[PDB]
């Protein structure tokens, strides 16, 4: 069961990365890829389950943040605009 889930997860991740690079590329400060942004969000969601909010820096392309917000993937902090969290789809 474990190895099956691992194969699925790795396949899903590789295909998701290829889809992101093919459909959400950077235009050309130092911006990070949407893949790295999603990785940071997913990592903070499970490393700090009591505070999954990450601060929005200048390396976050505002179109990427608005894209994640419109599609229900990212959620804004109720009071702090500089922080966004990942929607806990596992619960």
């Amino acid at each position: 069961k474990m190895l099956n889930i691992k194969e699925y997860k790795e396949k899903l991740l590789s295909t998701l990365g290829e889809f992101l690079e093919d459909h959400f590329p950077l235009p050309d400060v130092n911006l990070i890829t949407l893949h790295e942004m999603l990785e940071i969000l997913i990592n903070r969601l499970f490393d700090v389950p009591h505070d999954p909010y990450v601060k929005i820096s200048d390396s976050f392309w505002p179109p990427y943040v608005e894209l994640l917000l419109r599609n229900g993937i990212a959620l804004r902090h109720p009071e702090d605009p500089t922080r966004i969290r990942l929607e806990a789809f596992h619960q």
């Binding site: 889930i5 991740l13 997913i42 806990a88 789809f89």
Partner: protein, 47 residues
């Protein structure tokens, strides 16, 4: 602690991929790989 959290992470990745495919408005049936991967979603990881 690995298996349960990996199940949760895989569920999160499923949902994120599905929402991104929906937001991109891509005719995913035209792309064969994208089509066969879209049908891979909606699989209960805890099975």
């Amino acid at each position: 602690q690995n298996l349960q959290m990996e199940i949760k992470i895989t569920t999160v990745i499923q949902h994120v991929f599905q929402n991104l495919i929906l937001g991109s408005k891509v005719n995913w049936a035209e792309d064969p790989a994208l089509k066969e991967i879209v049908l891979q979603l909606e699989k209960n990881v805890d099975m």
